[PDB]
Amino acid sequence: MSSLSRELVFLILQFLDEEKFKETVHKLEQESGFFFNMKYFEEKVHAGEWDEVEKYLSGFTKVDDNRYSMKIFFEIRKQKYLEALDRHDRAKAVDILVKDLKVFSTFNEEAYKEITQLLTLENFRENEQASKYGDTKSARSIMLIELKKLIEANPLFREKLVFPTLKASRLRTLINQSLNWQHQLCKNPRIKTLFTDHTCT
């Protein structure tokens, strides 16, 4: 993808945001991979929207890209697991443990074992190393702090965290410039559409 094409995506990102096409904005961020919206990410983490959190992340990194991303996905999936235990849904917890958390066992067996063991506790805060889990809201917040640090230090995100400074409606301004250019070609000069060049017979 060109540097032109990349800048065009940013212009479109601005336009979509100004038009309040919110889901479209974040899909473009994700699919282009050009910009990671930390504000959006914090919002989805605070809301515990783990499926979207991972889907969004997938546009930027895979679990085994490097140690930062591994810990990012591990922390997220661990929190998802802990929340399942907290609502006393052990069936879902085991599902999470096997589907989502097992990939980390290779990289740390004893950690995966200790997390597995939480399944059999009446309240998983009985484990002194898991006794620091407060409630869901605080747990998400303290983890989000770590997630932000990890993402900001993750080399895969290094030029993707700050939106370019642009004047508002930059794409619309360029479009208007296009229409000026088209009209400037006419003689004798007296707009139907953006779809075809304008003309004055």
Partner: peptide, 7 residues
């Protein structure tokens, strides 16, 4: 504990 840490 699956843990890289950072500064």
């Amino acid at each position: 504990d699956n843990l890289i840490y950072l500064d």
